[PDB]
């Protein structure tokens, strides 16, 4: 298919945000490169939740000021999202920061019966990530590099 990087990225980010909001792992089969995407999801469960615990106050402080309740507000977040790159630095930390921000928003949407807004939220996040940093992601081997970046000694 056309633009496989975007499709895969949306698949990963969609399922993570929805799983974070509902607390239930998805079981619907994934598509091309889904095996790598499964490992990236598990990586996000570990790393993403670690970021959320250590910085929940900062993230909650943002939600308080944002006061988003509908689809329009969700899309309006793109202006905020791009600031993870504001200093000219790009790394998997900034991307995990952005996705973790999405997780806090997705959890909120759940609590006000806006699960339908999680899908356009994931599209907005994937837009900021892929539409502005595609060159960086390709050079970093995409989600396979993501998985290898967070490899734990175990």
């Amino acid at each position: 298919g056309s633009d496989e990087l975007y499709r895969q990225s949306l698949e990963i980010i969609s399922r993570y945000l929805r799983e974070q909001a509902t607390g239930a792992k998805d079981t619907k089969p994934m598509g091309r490169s889904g095996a790598t995407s499964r490992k990236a999801l598990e990586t996000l469960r570990r790393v993403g939740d670690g970021v959320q615990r250590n910085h929940e106050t900062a993230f909650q402080g943002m939600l308080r000021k944002l006061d988003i309740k509908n689809e329009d507000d969700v899309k309006s977040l793109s202006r905020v999202m791009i600031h993870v790159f504001s200093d000219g630095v790009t790394n998997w930390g900034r991307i995990v920061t952005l996705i973790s921000f999405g997780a806090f928003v997705a959890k909120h949407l759940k609590t006000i019966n806006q699960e339908s807004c999680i899908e356009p939220l994931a599209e907005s996040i994937t837009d900021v990530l892929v539409r502005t940093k595609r060159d960086w992601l390709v050079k970093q081997r995409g989600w396979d590099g993501f998985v290898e970046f967070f490899h734990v000694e175990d």
């Binding site: 970021v51 910085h55 900062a58 944002l66 600031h83 200093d87 998997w92 930390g93 921000f101």
Partner: peptide
Amino acid sequence: DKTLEEIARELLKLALEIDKEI
């Protein structure tokens, strides 16, 4: 003085904190 602009700066600040971890 916009809340959205203020939040954007906080998001950058938070990202720089997270660089120290991952």
